[PDB]
Amino acid sequence: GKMLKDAIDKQVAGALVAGTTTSTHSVATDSTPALQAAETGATSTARDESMIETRTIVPTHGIHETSVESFFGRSSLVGMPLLATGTSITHWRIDFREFVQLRAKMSWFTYMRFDVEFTIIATSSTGQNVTTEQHTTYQVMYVPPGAPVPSNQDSFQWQSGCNPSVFADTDGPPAQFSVPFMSSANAYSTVYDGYARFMDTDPDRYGILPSNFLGFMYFRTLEDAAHQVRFRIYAKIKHTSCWIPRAPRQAPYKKRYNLVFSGDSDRICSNRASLTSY
Amino acid sequence: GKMLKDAIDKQVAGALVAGTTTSTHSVATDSTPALQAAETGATSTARDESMIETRTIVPTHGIHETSVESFFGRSSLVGMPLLATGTSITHWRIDFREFVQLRAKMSWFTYMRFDVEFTIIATSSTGQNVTTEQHTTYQVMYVPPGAPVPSNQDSFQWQSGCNPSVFADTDGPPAQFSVPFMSSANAYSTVYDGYARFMDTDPDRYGILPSNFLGFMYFRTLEDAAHQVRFRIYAKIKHTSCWIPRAPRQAPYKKRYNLVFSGDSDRICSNRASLTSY
Amino acid sequence: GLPTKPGPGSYQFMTTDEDCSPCILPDFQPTPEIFIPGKVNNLLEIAQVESILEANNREGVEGVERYVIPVSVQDALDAQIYALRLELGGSGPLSSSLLGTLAKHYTQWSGSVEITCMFTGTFMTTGKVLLAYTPPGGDMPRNREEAMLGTHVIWDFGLQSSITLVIPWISASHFRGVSNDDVLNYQYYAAGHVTIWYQTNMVIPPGFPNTAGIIMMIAAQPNFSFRIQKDREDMTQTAILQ
Amino acid sequence: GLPTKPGPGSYQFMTTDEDCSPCILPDFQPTPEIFIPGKVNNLLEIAQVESILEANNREGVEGVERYVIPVSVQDALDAQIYALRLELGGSGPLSSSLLGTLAKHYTQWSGSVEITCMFTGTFMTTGKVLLAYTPPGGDMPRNREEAMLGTHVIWDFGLQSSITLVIPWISASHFRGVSNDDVLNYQYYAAGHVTIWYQTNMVIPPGFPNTAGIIMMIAAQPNFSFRIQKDREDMTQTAILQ
Amino acid sequence: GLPTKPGPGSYQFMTTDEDCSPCILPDFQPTPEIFIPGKVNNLLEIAQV
Amino acid sequence: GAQGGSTINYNNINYYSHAASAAQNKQDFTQDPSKFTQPIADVIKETAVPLK
Amino acid sequence: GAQGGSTINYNNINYYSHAASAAQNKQDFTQDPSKFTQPIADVIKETAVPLK
Amino acid sequence: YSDRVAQLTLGNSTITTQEAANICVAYGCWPAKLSDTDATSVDKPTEPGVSADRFYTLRSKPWQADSKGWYWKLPDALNNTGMFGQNAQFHYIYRGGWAVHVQCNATKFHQGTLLVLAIPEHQIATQEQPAFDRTMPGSEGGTFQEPFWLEDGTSLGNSLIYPHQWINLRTNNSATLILPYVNAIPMDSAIRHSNWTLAIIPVAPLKYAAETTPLVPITVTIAPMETEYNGLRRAIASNQ
Amino acid sequence: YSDRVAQLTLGNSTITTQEAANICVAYGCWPAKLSDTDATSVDKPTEPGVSADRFYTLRSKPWQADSKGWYWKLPDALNNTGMFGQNAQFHYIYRGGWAVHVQCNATKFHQGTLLVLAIPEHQIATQEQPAFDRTMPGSEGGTFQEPFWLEDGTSLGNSLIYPHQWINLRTNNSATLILPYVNAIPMDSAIRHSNWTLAIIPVAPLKYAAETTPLVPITVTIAPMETEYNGLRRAIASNQ
Ligand SMILES: CCCCCCCCCCCCCC(=O)O
Ligand SMILES: CCCCCCCCCCCCCC(=O)O
Ligand SMILES: CCCCCCCCCCCCCC(=O)O
Ligand SMILES: CCCCCCCCCCCCCC(=O)O
């Protein structure tokens, strides 16, 4: 049926890399492809065929593993809240900045528009952190800014009449759910050269764009936990638009909410004793 | 096939918000859009374009998250009966008034016609309420008004020849089932300015419309429970018709079966010291 | 049997699931739908209805009187009548209105808002009032000279009892945050100021009431919307209701 | 119910799964996409942009100066300016460039690379330079006589400030390994050598700076690609960021 | 295998379920239906007596 | 719907017999705000004076 | 696609209502490398001298 | 041309006002008779016509300095009045709409504002569940004690969602509301259930150009509209 | 025929250079006005035209032997200058592109190379989160302390991904960049957010054919392009 045709999108990865045309020797004063001028800011236009004698090469290699979708389109850890047994409650602030691998991958772009698939793995363990048996339901509640936060395991906030929740078992399959692009802005921002507030220039609000922050995930067990639970929160970025590539992060990350780095030794690649030998 | 076409309904959320037409300055005695009269009971008709000079704005925002279906169309807690080990039996009276979030959401309307998806999460725990292991079947029996109630775990009422029952495991996936609009009336009523009975004006039967009450859910374990079981009963309202919007509840709820409130301090929003500063 | 691979998310219960589920009474045939007046299909039909601002929120004012802003005969020129931070969230006067109480259920908002004011003085009582909307970036306007630089209407008391100041959607972004969540710096979404000033003065015949009132009313324009349902802050319980 | 047989891989979570999954907010309607300049659809658009080699990686050179290879007036003929093992992996100068940092995320590479050199001496400073690419099998070329036997360009300093040596894809196989993993003998994928020589000499007018610089720049050609994502070696953490 | 997501209500037994279920005697061929007087299709035929 | 902008386009497929089993309806239905905003016998056009 | 060479050909089938539920997009989209490599008012053809 | 001048003629009765605002027609729905598709009761209804579809005037109320407001249940307030009252007493079930007219004149030397609410299904409470003398107060009506909370734990400010008009003394001396039948069933008992509440709440207090405060009454006039009755038996006056 | 000679005329102002390289147009995108499909703010924008779309010259900088570099935030650097500055002060939100022209002449007896970066959303840090005097330095601009790390934990070598030119003294004395508006929203506040940073970093140091080092200034000239402003109120100068 055509109605089911609406739920199917045929999508194709068949873009190839550029090929090579055979070329011959050139002795002239007409064509000088090797002479360049980096001052313009343009990258060199010279190609293989104009610099040496080439054979013909039919293109066969795909480019799809470096499409922005493929590069971001896998799951990565973004949150690891620990539910202790004293209160049986925990939360994770929602952003991709606690764990460095996804953050550094995002640092190649300025603005990014995407959806998210979240995946939550819960693991129970003892005080000495050895795996242990515990079968219990847990509740993950999305708490958006301005909604009252639960303060206990039995708080009546966990009613969840308006906050969305997911209920799953600690020893069941992983909870998984998708999320549309939720920013009030038309993209997310990986970096922000401004202040979070008018009438304020506190350093702690520099580089803080609050339209990236959609709130909190809160976690309880539905009864009081017998053992601590660790939730691992994975995000896969999908349906991805990217704008304005950047110099990628090179210094290690130090803080969650700013770009501070050490910068004690100004170098990235390793040293050698002489430029004319390895 | 066309027969399977009967089981598919293509349904679309593409209603947009109103746009903006550009306007220019107006110097006249003809058109006075800013002059109003609130005495009529009509809301102001003045629009942006007639009050200031506007640009053109193409509408892009949807309205679907405030459709009545979307606003009610999620699950909320409505019942939390506890099955103790002494009798291994409990029940929940069926109405959406024990827990305040769903009740307050319903208080925006007078009459509401809907279906229900119920979801039941069972959790076992110790006397000190710490999660514990217990694998057992439980039985939820719909007991409508006039059907004899079970008095024990082994009562022969649990035969369930005519009452519908659901059997599920305490440590299995949650039981879930749907329900059509069951009122003898043509809608449910969120508020009732009348008496439950003729020839009676007892205050305890004021505001009681018994056509909202479809009876009881009764709960046993199929054997005698070793640990207490807590059932959490969630309802999602769906296929929703709503009539006659109301002033929504503002004072906290106090009782399950009437609108009594404290009303000690007559205000809702917070105070300030002066109307001409914040 | 058809070979399958159940994946992650198996057996979870999400409260916003959109799935069919078996009916426990599959033979039931409900009562017909009858005509009832006032069917609502979308809560933005309610948000476009005017409601009264709890505008006189001064410490010590209780009850119905919180709904009338005082307006008096002035002995000095260009005085201020009222000041209000434009906010759908928080706990100020807009928060208890129809639009404000709907905004309590939502995280984000967009669109134009209108404020309709009704004067309640005697027939013989005259006056002119300046109603100003100041876009964000600074503080509340300090004097009528500063407030007039913004969007503003000038109200002449007369036969038509009421005026509208349309607060237009003026915004860097397509949406703002409803809340003012501090830890999350949602003051980023500061939406400006509404102030009311005496444009001339309130003038009365000898021995008339030297004080009258404005009843402020607010509603959403047709270009308005809400996103992201969220729990209402002030609808709580400490126990199951019995 | 339809008879089924869940098979192996049931309930597993693979990080590269391509599966639909229930949306926790199925009624949400996002903000429109606006025009933004510089949309990127494929990271090989970045890899074709020239970036500066951290080429002066001698022990003791810090900061911006690591970006300028010294070039001097020579007192002897046919001297060497620079030597560089052609490698997208490891930790040598190519590893910190745009192409090198992308290669840190990938396991395999193919295609031609170009190196653009810009001379920074005074207008009056002259010179000719030989830039050589030696295919693998042996060591770095020891003298300009040996290096010239390979692919090479000869650069005349003049008005056009810059030159390109195209390092063409010359390879037994369609792809090479990015890394030089020793236990796995990925030196099998040795990709050759780049060396720079004085073709004549740097010559200056009396009392001019006798030392100038080359800024080396590198980028991928349009026939280039990467395979197999892999973790970046030098982007680590010992603790959760707070 | 076809990727699936079993949801809530998995493995429950509801007494009013309307589902097909495997027949323990799939080759059985019942006796024909004969005419009997007084066939009832709906209990409101009894309620009108 | 593999995407138009703010158009969610859904094929609700009910697997059970009773219509009540179906998932929630995603249609946008007609809005008549004026039964609540303009509930008056005589229409008052925006450019007119309301009283008289 | 039971295989052409480097052509992955996929029918993304979304089972849920919201487009955000769909799996990741496998299309190759247009590459305009020259907005980053040749970001200059006057085009410089390969065979010409760049300056002047 | 003038929505400040109105005339309302029902039966043998006619109202006029020279300072109206307009006429509020609740939910844009004029009262209408019950169609065969929504009806359930099989007996042929009695439709009394002009004998009941006419304006009835209740006793007037003084607007005092301290007044919190007044309220009337419908049909409750008219259940003992005229042929409406008799038809409502003699039948088990009743249906119909209302034409409500609130009168209050004062001077150009007065100020003050009344809010005139028609509230459907206005179930009331306070710190306690209310007694019968407040839920069904009869022709004399009741008084608010929590006008800020609209006697129901909601707020007066948000009650503009209900059909309403104002009486602002500088502008008008009268409010008119036309109310359709509202219920979740087709017909319902007149003695057991109140479909509408007429509520008149002072918002801006009543002030005079002197300190001597003459008598300013409020007067309610209500006409049933498009009435039907089914279930004829003896006459029953109240649910007690 | 000659991309070494350029003339730039905006408003009442005209720049010339006899040693340009070319003109960099960032992302191949000429500045453009906001279309009705992407716009959200409903008020009619003010477009000041030539009163603001004109070249402004900042104070010059000496290129010294030790110089690490200089930077300016935009619109920050021009927020107190001319009618651009006034339109940016008096409106809540602003949008527009830039025409940037960096001048530095020296002799055929000099050597040295400047890198001229236009960096969008250039959020900066060092071992510490920066203060306001560095995030929004004004017309005088700031200076780099970590030019190798591009003040942001990235690398200067990879910043050629950003729109750029060089000033290599043997080749050219000037760099020209045309910048489109870049943001994740349609308009944004001029005092709270800097959309672009103009960064001028010495890569090859400045050397003279003698040991006596005369003064070689760097001079920045910036023209706003295709500007709009919405949200008129009083004038607000800074985010403090
Ligand atoms: C739990 C359902 C709603 C949660 C919304 C999650 C959306 C996350 C998007 C994060 C984008 C900003 C990333 C960042 O600031 O580093
Ligand atoms: C268990 C199967 C039959 C149960 C029927 C449940 C229907 C519940 C509808 C409740 C509507 C009235 C809500 C209320 O009174 O507050
Ligand atoms: C077992 C029979 C398979 C039929 C299900 C096909 C997929 C469900 C249709 C979903 C339609 C809306 C999806 C969308 O376009 O957003
Ligand atoms: C339950 C309905 C069954 C429909 C699923 C049919 C198989 C999925 C289509 C996969 C299309 C791409 C596969 C390929 O050719 O590589």
Author numbering:
A (entry chain 1), B (entry chain 1): 4 to 281
C (entry chain 3), D (entry chain 3): 1 to 242
E (entry chain 3): 1 to 49
F (entry chain 4), G (entry chain 4): 2 to 4, 21 to 69
H (entry chain 2), I (entry chain 2): 9 to 248
Q: What's the paper's own text on this?
A:
The structure of the EV-E virion was determined by cryo-EM single particle analysis at 2.2 Å resolution. Atomic models of the four capsid proteins reveal typical picornavirus-like folds, having jelly-roll motifs with extended N-terminal arms that are not all complete within the map. The cryo-EM density allows us to build atomic models for more of these features than was possible in the previous X-ray map. The atomic coordinates for VP1, VP2 and VP4 were updated from the X-ray structure and ~20% of the previously missing residues were unequivocally assigned (regions in pink). The VP1 N-terminal domain was updated with 10 additional residues, which extend to the innermost surface of the five-fold pores. The structure in this region was corrected and modelled according to the EM density map, which is similar to that of the recently determined EV-F X-ray structure. This density map also allowed us to assign the VP2 sequence up to residue Y9, which is located precisely at the three-fold axis. VP4 was assigned up to residue G21 (orientated towards the five-fold axis) and its C-terminus completed up to K69. There are two myristic acid groups associated with the structure. One is bound as the VP1 pocket factor. A second myristate is visible at the end of a disconnected portion of protein density, which we assigned to the G2-Q4 position of VP4 both because of its location with respect to the remainder of VP4 and the known myristylation site at the N-terminus of poliovirus VP4.
